[PDB]
């Protein structure tokens, strides 16, 4: 609200991410949960480090289950 509160926000250095990239949140029983893949399509293939590949099955509101 207050211009002072309006500021500090442009100095938080809030990062950003491409719509075709995301990051792993948890790893359990062959299921991986990923954050940020906004352009993922159901059934699309996800590339992880090491040449491991996954398949997006749960496109939930704030997490992708692969």
């Amino acid at each position: 609200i207050s211009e002072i509160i309006k500021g500090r926000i442009e100095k938080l250095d809030v990062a950003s991410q491409a719509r075709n990239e995301g990051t792993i949140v948890s790893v359990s029983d062959g299921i991986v949960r990923i954050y940020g893949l906004a352009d993922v399509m159901y059934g699309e293939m996800i590339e992880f480090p090491g040449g491991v590949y996954g398949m997006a099955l749960n496109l939930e509101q704030d997490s992708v289950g692969a």
């Binding site: 609200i1 207050s2 002072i4 509160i5 500090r8 926000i9 938080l12 809030v14 990062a15 950003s16 990051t23 949140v25 954050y35 704030d62």
Partner: protein, 177 residues
């Protein structure tokens, strides 16, 4: 569950504290500011990242509000962040005022007249509405051109309608039945 159910403990905690320390007006401003900051698109995006710890997210929000939060408010912010509830700040801010209003013995009414507005008219009804409700009334008059002639008075779950649209509705169901 309803955001209200999840915000009830946090809000009652803020209120019992503000009351026993005579801070019922300071926390209103602090909660309104915290609610406001959290809704901004840049802050909303920041709070939804897996890289930050609960303390880091909590700290970043106290820094943007700064003086707006007294020692206690900043600690309350740390409790909300620790429990991962920073998405409920607008709801937490709303329910605090409701507990406060019942304490101050007041109501925010929302009057809607058809085509006329006068300083005499607002008080003329604030006396009866106050008498009926047994509370002080902070009227918030507005304009509703949809109505042919009359006013609709909303206070809490009570809705005293004296609008001609209301008499039209009655006459219509009566004539078709």
């Amino acid at each position: 569950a309803e955001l209200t159910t999840l915000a009830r403990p946090y809000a009652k905690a803020a209120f019992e504290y503000a009351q026993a320390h005579q801070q019922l007006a300071d926390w209103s401003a602090a909660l309104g500011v915290l609610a406001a900051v959290s809704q901004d698109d840049t802050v909303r995006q920041l709070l939804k990242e897996p890289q930050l710890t609960s303390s880091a997210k909590a700290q970043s929000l106290i820094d943007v509000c700064g003086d707006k939060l007294n020692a206690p408010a900043q600690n309350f912010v740390r409790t909300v962040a620790e429990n991962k509830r920073l998405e409920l700040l607008p709801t937490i801010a709303e329910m605090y005022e409701q507990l406060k209003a019942e304490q101050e013995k007041s109501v925010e009414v929302e009057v809607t007249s058809a085509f006329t507005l006068s300083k005499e008219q607002q008080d003329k009804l604030a006396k009866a509405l106050s008498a009926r409700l047994s509370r002080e009334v902070r009227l918030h008059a507005s304009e509703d051109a949809s109505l042919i002639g009359g006013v609709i008075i909303r206070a809490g779950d009570l809705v005293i309608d004296g609008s001609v649209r209301g008499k039209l509705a009655k006459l219509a169901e009566a004539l078709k039945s």
